[PDB]
Design a binder for this molecule. Structure first.
Ligand SMILES: [Mg+2]
Ligand SMILES: [Mg+2]
Ligand SMILES: [Mg+2]
Ligand SMILES: [Mg+2]
Ligand SMILES: [Mg+2]
Ligand SMILES: [Mg+2]
Ligand SMILES: [Mg+2]
Ligand SMILES: [Mg+2]
Ligand SMILES: [Mg+2]
Ligand SMILES: [Mg+2]
Ligand SMILES: [Mg+2]
Ligand SMILES: [Mg+2]
Ligand SMILES: [Mg+2]
Ligand SMILES: [Mg+2]
Ligand SMILES: [Mg+2]
Ligand SMILES: [Mg+2]
Ligand SMILES: [Mg+2]
Ligand SMILES: [Mg+2]
Ligand SMILES: [Mg+2]
Ligand SMILES: [Mg+2]
Ligand SMILES: [Mg+2]
Ligand SMILES: [Mg+2]
Ligand SMILES: [Mg+2]
Ligand SMILES: [Mg+2]
Ligand SMILES: [Mg+2]
Ligand SMILES: [Mg+2]
Ligand SMILES: [Mg+2]
Ligand SMILES: [Mg+2]
Ligand SMILES: [Mg+2]
Ligand SMILES: [Mg+2]
Ligand SMILES: [Mg+2]
Ligand SMILES: [Mg+2]
Ligand SMILES: [Mg+2]
Ligand SMILES: [Mg+2]
Ligand SMILES: [Mg+2]
Ligand SMILES: [Mg+2]
Ligand SMILES: [Mg+2]
Ligand SMILES: [Mg+2]
Ligand SMILES: [Mg+2]
Ligand SMILES: [Mg+2]
Ligand SMILES: [Mg+2]
Ligand SMILES: [Mg+2]
Ligand SMILES: [Mg+2]
Ligand SMILES: [Mg+2]
Ligand SMILES: [Mg+2]
Ligand SMILES: [Mg+2]
Ligand SMILES: [Mg+2]
Ligand SMILES: [Mg+2]
Ligand SMILES: [Mg+2]
Ligand SMILES: [Mg+2]
Ligand SMILES: [Mg+2]
Ligand SMILES: [Mg+2]
Ligand SMILES: [Mg+2]
Ligand SMILES: [Mg+2]
Ligand SMILES: [Mg+2]
Ligand SMILES: [Mg+2]
Ligand SMILES: [Mg+2]
Ligand SMILES: [Mg+2]
Ligand SMILES: [Mg+2]
Ligand SMILES: [Mg+2]
Ligand SMILES: [Mg+2]
Ligand SMILES: [Mg+2]
Ligand SMILES: [Mg+2]
Ligand SMILES: [Mg+2]
Ligand SMILES: [Mg+2]
Ligand SMILES: [Mg+2]
Ligand SMILES: [Mg+2]
Ligand SMILES: [Mg+2]
Ligand SMILES: [Mg+2]
Ligand SMILES: [Mg+2]
Ligand SMILES: [Mg+2]
Ligand SMILES: [Mg+2]
Ligand SMILES: [Mg+2]
Ligand SMILES: [Mg+2]
Ligand SMILES: [Mg+2]
Ligand SMILES: [Mg+2]
Ligand SMILES: [Mg+2]
Ligand SMILES: [Mg+2]
Ligand SMILES: [Mg+2]
Ligand SMILES: [Mg+2]
Ligand SMILES: [Mg+2]
Ligand SMILES: [Mg+2]
Ligand SMILES: [Mg+2]
Ligand SMILES: [Mg+2]
Ligand SMILES: [Mg+2]
Ligand SMILES: [Mg+2]
Ligand SMILES: [Mg+2]
Ligand SMILES: [Mg+2]
Ligand SMILES: [Mg+2]
Ligand SMILES: [Mg+2]
Ligand SMILES: [Mg+2]
Ligand SMILES: [Mg+2]
Lengths: 77, 22, 59
RNA sequence: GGGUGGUGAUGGCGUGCCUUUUGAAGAAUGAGCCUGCGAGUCAGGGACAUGUCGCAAGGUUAACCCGUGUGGGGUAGCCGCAGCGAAAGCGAGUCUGAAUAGGGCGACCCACACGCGCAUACGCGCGUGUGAAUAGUGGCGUGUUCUGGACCCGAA
RNA sequence: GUUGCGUGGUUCACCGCGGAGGUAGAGCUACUGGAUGGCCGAUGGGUUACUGACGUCAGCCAAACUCCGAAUGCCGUGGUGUAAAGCGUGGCAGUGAGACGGCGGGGGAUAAGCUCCGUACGUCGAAAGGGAAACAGCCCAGAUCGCCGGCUAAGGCCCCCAAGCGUGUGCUAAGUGGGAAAGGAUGUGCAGUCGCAAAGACAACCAGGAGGUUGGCUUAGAAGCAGCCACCCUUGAAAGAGUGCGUAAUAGCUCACUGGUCAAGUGAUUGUGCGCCGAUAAUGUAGCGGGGCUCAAGCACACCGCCGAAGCCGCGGCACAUCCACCUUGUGGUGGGUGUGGGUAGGGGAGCGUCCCUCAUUCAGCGAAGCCACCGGGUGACCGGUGGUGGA
RNA sequence: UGCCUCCUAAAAUGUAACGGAGGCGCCCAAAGGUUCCCUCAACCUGGACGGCAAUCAGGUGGCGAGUGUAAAUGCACAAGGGAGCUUGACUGCGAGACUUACAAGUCAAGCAGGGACGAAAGUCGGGAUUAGUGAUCCGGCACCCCCGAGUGGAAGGGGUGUCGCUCAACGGAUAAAAGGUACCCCGGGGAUAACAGGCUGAUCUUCCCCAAGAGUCCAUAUCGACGGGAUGGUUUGGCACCUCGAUGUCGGCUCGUCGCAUCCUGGGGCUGGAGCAGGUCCCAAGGGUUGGGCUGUUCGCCCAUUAAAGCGGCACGCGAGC
RNA sequence: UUACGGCGGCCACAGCGGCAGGGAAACGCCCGGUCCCAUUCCGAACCCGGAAGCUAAGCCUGCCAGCGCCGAUGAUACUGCCCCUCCGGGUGGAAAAGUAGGACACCGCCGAACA
């Protein structure tokens, strides 16, 4: 038969996506949304990360918002 | 194919409610 | 005001949420009955397990 | 008439047992029958965990010695007693480090009571004590494990 | 999974609140592609019947399209509820061949009792009982034990077979019910939509239904009629170089179109309920389980009962977990609650029986063991008594 | 066969198939850091060589361009374009997270040292992000002087940094490895093939629906294309459900038995049926349905006949019957 | 308080475009490049020095739905959970598109005159 296994490979699922949702209390350094590119943008008190990870600079509550079209994640202390 | 069809059709009894193993 | 819920169908074959909602009302077996206040939480529970119980506004 | 014990016309229900399987009454395996026999055992101061008992900041001996014995000796040793570090080393600290930076590992050991250096009588610390599970240690029981054939049988 | 030691509501359910989404769907002049029909028109092609870029007007399509976009699900949080939630850490596991059914998908031929995933989906596995004729995986329902009590579930109630040859209103003629497609069909019941008509409707009948424009031509004749083709007017109730037969034609039997003639509906047409045909493999009716059933025992709707399980309730026995009150208030007992008690792998707990040893005690030649029979007993392994046999 | 990206994937995460698509085993001394500046493609208009498309000018143009490299997510605020200076492509760390069986993998504010750029604020522990990789062992090299087998050394070892595997079957059995067995053996499996059964019915088979046509005219005497719907379960398959502590495989012989989709005989309708013969369809399974040549054959062809030399099922009926 | 100047919130209901009107301070264009700084050429820009000129443009105001944008209600699609042979039905949610319409933004912090 035809050896049509020309496409049978894939990479590992990288477990992307939002890790801490709105109104959820987090500590500083705790990653909020791990993603490719800037699907979400760092808001107030949120750092970006070398691989666009959007961590918390400070403890407090996660909140999502819009900043001139760009959708952003911030922490309110 | 008759045996297969008859077995398949006997799900359509009230006691079976349209559902039956295999 | 004050609802009166009787379990009439088995939990055999019921989903997680139905079994746990019957547990939350405190229903244990067929023709068990419990009395609970008619609040939003109770009506949500009853809505989840509507087909397994009958309810009446019994004092 | 009633109750035992035997039988059982007649009516209903009713697909052996084991193994192994998604699933066997299975037309998958094994078993003719009976009687007898036939499979997680033992050793070790082994290892881990537990139950229990002794002693307890200690515990315990090994060989061996002496005893008619299972008893009495026997401190060599082992475990506990301080940790950190590759190590030198330092030590309730220590390692990394330039760091009176941060981190890693480690110490702040228990319940009840008294006693103090004393808070009006109620308490921090530190000491007796009493745990005769304290905290370990030794014995004994159990489960698991290690090395042995290691639950038993079976090749080519 | 179990079990020990900790922790304690952290689990889970429901309600509310705060959040991310790109599935379903949809949309696409919002992108990338696919793609239908118009209109204009760059080009190309042989001045331009050919091409028709781009636009423009509309209608569409997509797992790897998205200007959009749910329901669910998920994360957090606050209340409420819920005993046998959760979590940590140890001891001991087994399992790591799954099956089918529902829902969403891939592979396949949108085949497979196929295969591969998803699914706080189910059941079987490891689940007995009831229903499905029989029938792991469907429906009902989770068996602690006993009862010659009751109520129900699914499913049923003419006989097999417990309960209705139940009641009311209709439908079916096919044994449809009690298998099947494209499609065929003046079957039948019901709900609609138009034409004509007492100024006489449809069916049936007499009279009548033609002349020049019988052009093109095939040709023996095309003259409507072997075929394609003029593509229109007029004495007249109406009336075509003509609806179907038919000949080489000429011809011939008639239908379109009305009058009189006879006295009440008659034609089309749509959706539907129940039917018909299509229908068709090999041991024997063999596609209601059987008898039988339309005088329904079939179907639809409405209603009334009843039967029906190991479900629930009643009465009694047992057990496990946990809680509350008395007794040396934890070694724990007693009483009473509440909950629970299907189970394979497997975990934990507690026991029966055999033999041997030690200690104590007690039987035994007036008869032990072993064996046999009978009568009794315990929740189980099993136990006791009596007698027979027997001989330590 | 490892890694990366997408879809499948059912709007968290995750999710399989020998499902659908592609990439990677690098590159860059700037394509890194920082500071500052800029905006693209396409279209339209005009313009020596120059044209559709080189450079120029003006408009329009918010992203249709570009991004080192696949895809996705991003990026016009730019992460895209350009320029200046630089080496943070740091050392000592690291609260807290993500992910995860483990091993791994990933993010990280912030502190210190010493720097880069910047006027400062600040940013910089490589690159828009996610591939460009390899555990442990055993060794090598540089440094530190930690240990230094009586002592001083030294050898050797240790630490810190780093190097050596298409170990690519990419969690990496050995440093080191191909085949045959029909001479085969053993342990197993119906966990898995060959026969037969079962499901399916693509294929096969037998019909049917529609009717473009063919038939002088005329679709329907007969034949019917393009398409459509089914039957059967006799073909070749698909699946792998019973059987591997055995279900004997083809053909023949013998004996049958059943279906009817009928070969003959029987009864009919239509005919492009004058008659004789036929064609087609319908009904019909009671009986019959030959002997040879060739081939293991089934099948098939042939010979001679015949009323006819039917087609199938029954473990492709039948080896405890041959 | 103004047809003014000043910096943000917000990122189209705000944008873009069209048509008018506005110059007190201010924003601007504007005049130059001896003077810091600058052009991968250009004093265009950037930067510096000025106030002869002007609201032509930017900017501001007002009006326009034109190009866009926002957009219900209802209905439908889809759907959780039930009931049920599908068809279906109950119940809880509920789009996209389209329509009615909305809309030429709104809000916040100092100076000039006024006052
Ligand atoms: Mg991926
Ligand atoms: Mg990086
Ligand atoms: Mg099993
Ligand atoms: Mg099997
Ligand atoms: Mg057997
Ligand atoms: Mg048998
Ligand atoms: Mg076997
Ligand atoms: Mg046997
Ligand atoms: Mg050490
Ligand atoms: Mg420290
Ligand atoms: Mg002790
Ligand atoms: Mg022992
Ligand atoms: Mg062996
Ligand atoms: Mg455990
Ligand atoms: Mg919400
Ligand atoms: Mg949502
Ligand atoms: Mg997608
Ligand atoms: Mg869709
Ligand atoms: Mg397009
Ligand atoms: Mg077109
Ligand atoms: Mg989509
Ligand atoms: Mg395995
Ligand atoms: Mg597996
Ligand atoms: Mg599976
Ligand atoms: Mg499916
Ligand atoms: Mg299967
Ligand atoms: Mg499933
Ligand atoms: Mg059952
Ligand atoms: Mg049953
Ligand atoms: Mg039965
Ligand atoms: Mg009753
Ligand atoms: Mg009922
Ligand atoms: Mg019976
Ligand atoms: Mg009866
Ligand atoms: Mg009835
Ligand atoms: Mg009657
Ligand atoms: Mg009746
Ligand atoms: Mg019938
Ligand atoms: Mg029938
Ligand atoms: Mg039919
Ligand atoms: Mg039939
Ligand atoms: Mg019960
Ligand atoms: Mg039990
Ligand atoms: Mg039970
Ligand atoms: Mg067990
Ligand atoms: Mg004697
Ligand atoms: Mg005697
Ligand atoms: Mg004895
Ligand atoms: Mg006895
Ligand atoms: Mg006796
Ligand atoms: Mg005796
Ligand atoms: Mg996902
Ligand atoms: Mg999902
Ligand atoms: Mg490749
Ligand atoms: Mg650079
Ligand atoms: Mg750039
Ligand atoms: Mg480097
Ligand atoms: Mg850390
Ligand atoms: Mg510094
Ligand atoms: Mg400087
Ligand atoms: Mg940093
Ligand atoms: Mg890159
Ligand atoms: Mg090695
Ligand atoms: Mg030396
Ligand atoms: Mg020496
Ligand atoms: Mg050296
Ligand atoms: Mg280091
Ligand atoms: Mg591997
Ligand atoms: Mg190796
Ligand atoms: Mg040979
Ligand atoms: Mg063998
Ligand atoms: Mg099999
Ligand atoms: Mg086969
Ligand atoms: Mg068989
Ligand atoms: Mg078939
Ligand atoms: Mg399978
Ligand atoms: Mg056998
Ligand atoms: Mg026939
Ligand atoms: Mg004939
Ligand atoms: Mg015959
Ligand atoms: Mg006869
Ligand atoms: Mg011869
Ligand atoms: Mg035959
Ligand atoms: Mg055969
Ligand atoms: Mg045969
Ligand atoms: Mg044979
Ligand atoms: Mg035979
Ligand atoms: Mg002025
Ligand atoms: Mg100038
Ligand atoms: Mg003006
Ligand atoms: Mg709406
Ligand atoms: Mg809308």
């Amino acid at each position: 038969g035809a050896s049509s296994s020309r496409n049978g490979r894939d990479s590992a699922a990288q477990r992307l996506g939002v890790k801490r949702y709105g109104g959820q209390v987090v500590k500083a350094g705790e990653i909020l949304v791990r993603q490719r590119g800037t699907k979400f943008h760092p808001g107030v008190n949120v750092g970006r990360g070398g691989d666009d990870t959007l961590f918390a600079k400070t403890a407090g509550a996660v909140e999502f918002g819009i900043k001139r079209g760009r959708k952003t994640v911030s922490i309110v202390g | 194919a008759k045996r297969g069809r008859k077995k398949r059709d006997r799900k359509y009894s009230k006691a079976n409610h349209g559902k039956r193993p295999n | 005001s004050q609802l009166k819920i009787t379990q009439v169908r088995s939990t055999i074959g019921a989903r997680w949420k139905q079994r746990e909602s019957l547990r939350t009302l405190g229903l244990r077996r067929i023709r068990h009955s419990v009395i609970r206040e008619d609040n939003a939480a109770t009506r949500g529970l009853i809505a989840v397990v509507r087909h397994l119980v009958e309810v009446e506004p019994a004092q």
